[PDB]
Amino acid sequence: ILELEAERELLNPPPSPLDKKFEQWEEQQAVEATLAAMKARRS
C-alpha cells in the first residue's frame, strides 16, 4: 500500500505550504473581510 500510495502522490504534486498559508491566510482575510462587511452592514 505504501508503495502505491507514494507513487500516486508523485503524479499529484501536492502544493507548497506557501499556497497553503496564502490560501489559509487569505481565507482568514476572506472570512474576516467577508464577515467584516457583515458585522458592519448588518450591525
Binding site: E27, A30, V31, T34, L35, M38, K39, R42
Partner: protein, 49 residues
C-alpha cells in the same frame, strides 16, 4: 440570520461554509464568460459560410 441576537459563532461557520461554493462559483463564472466569444466566433463562421 445567524449573527442576529449576538450569536456570531453560528454565522462564523456558515460564511466559512458559504465561500466553499463561492470558490466554485467564481471558477465557473469566468469559464462561462470565456465560452461566449467562441460560440459567438463560430456562429459568424457559419453565417459567413
Amino acid at each position: 440570520a445567524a449573527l442576529d441576537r449576538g450569536n456570531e459563532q453560528l454565522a462564523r461557520e456558515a460564511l466559512g461554509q458559504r465561500q466553499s461554493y463561492q470558490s466554485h462559483t467564481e471558477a465557473l463564472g469566468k469559464s462561462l464568460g470565456e465560452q461566449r466569444a467562441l460560440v459567438e466566433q463560430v456562429r459568424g463562421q457559419l453565417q459567413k459560410l
